[PDB]
Design a protein around this ligand. Structure first.
Ligand SMILES: OC[C@H]1O[C@H](O[C@H]2O[C@H](CO)[C@@H](O)[C@H](O)[C@H]2O)[C@H](O)[C@@H](O)[C@@H]1O
Ligand SMILES: OC[C@H]1O[C@H](O[C@H]2O[C@H](CO)[C@@H](O)[C@H](O)[C@H]2O)[C@H](O)[C@@H](O)[C@@H]1O
Ligand SMILES: [Fe+3]
Ligand SMILES: [Fe+3]
Lengths: 192, 192
């Protein structure tokens, strides 16, 4: 049914911020496993012919954990880039300034939400229904995609498999890696 | 203030099932961090004079997450032993045979609960109010210590940091490691 998407860049393209070995396990094993599991759960069910987002927004239990993780990881890979990092640009830079006053205050606010997102989790930059940006944390497979009117803009995976190989227990060091890779083109594409 | 308990065995005593590197990060860094963080949170609350278990059973939020994780890890180190593994003995073996019919059926049941305990979690062997054994899963820092009438007997930490260095994504391989280390003396002590 579903297929694991290709990575949007070569396996060593995020070096030295996220390693090749991390992409091999994170994309090639964890993301793949969610796709295999969902496909095993859907045959001959009321989800067998629905799109992935349709499944994510209409399931619970194991179907939801697997489908939402497939979606969350594809969004995460797009949130990184070997040509990303550095200062934000375009409409998202201005929207960040409108909410937090400055990019540095936004980065401090997102780092604080990410470091403190307890357990397996995701930290998201979203555009609320009212048009403003905000930072929100979700646990396990939960995702702002299920929230009517909220538009996911970027995400950082904080499950330990996302960073343990490269950074062990030090999330702030992984977050420095993330800021060096953040894909402002994808953020702007989602914001607009 | 609280202190990080010593490990009950040498750093390489669980080799080759859990590595020295895993114990250095897992005990020396993760377990330690929960101790430091709790020792920041307590003062100025109705907690600074309470024992660890008293805090675990009457707190929520960050105090609970750090205090429950300190308790859960100390319980987890005691659940392993370089002289453990193999068939269960004593009262716990008999109780296992009473609930599941055989040790092999128990192991299959616990393995299924642990492999499928989604996200950061713990799988516990507990003794119920009625005297029977059961397997229960908790998420993040939740623990049966807070359930009236339930007595924790053994635990397996399923947060990814407990096994990623040694086994990466393969929980079943980590669980084989756990069966080779399970401390039946601690289980029997807790059961009696
Ligand atoms: O996909 C199997 C089940 O996964 C979840 O439940 C598992 O993980 C929980 C922690 O996130 C545990 O509490 C639970 O015991 C496990 O079975 C999901 O919640 C279930 O609905 C799925 O069927
Ligand atoms: O210890 C600080 C807070 O930790 C928890 O909240 C963090 O982790 C949650 C995921 O488990 C996130 O949803 C949340 O946004 C983070 O702040 C705890 O639940 C809070 O009560 C603590 O203050
Ligand atoms: Fe992930
Ligand atoms: Fe742990």
């Amino acid at each position: 049914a579903f297929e694991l998407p290709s990575l949007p860049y070569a396996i060593d393209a995020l070096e030295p911020h996220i390693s090749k070995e991390t992409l091999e396990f994170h994309h090639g094993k964890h993301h793949n496993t969610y796709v295999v599991k969902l496909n095993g759960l859907i045959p001959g069910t009321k989800f067998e012919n629905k799109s992935l987002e349709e499944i994510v927004c209409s399931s619970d239990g194991g179907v939801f954990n697997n489908a939402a993780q497939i979606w969350n990881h594809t969004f995460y890979w797009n949130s990184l880039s070997p040509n990303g990092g550095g200062a934000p640009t375009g409409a998202v830079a201005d929207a960040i300034n409108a909410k937090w006053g400055s990019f540095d205050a936004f980065k401090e606010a997102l780092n604080d939400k990410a470091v403190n997102n307890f357990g397996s989790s995701w930290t998201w930059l979203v555009k609320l229904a009212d048009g403003s940006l905000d930072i929100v944390n979700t646990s396990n497979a939960a995702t702002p995609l299920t929230d009517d009117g909220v538009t996911p803009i970027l995400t950082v995976d904080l499950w330990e498999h996302a960073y343990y190989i490269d950074y062990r227990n030090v999330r702030p060091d992984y977050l420095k890696g993330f800021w060096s890779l953040v894909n402002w083109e994808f953020a702007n594409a989602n914001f607009a």
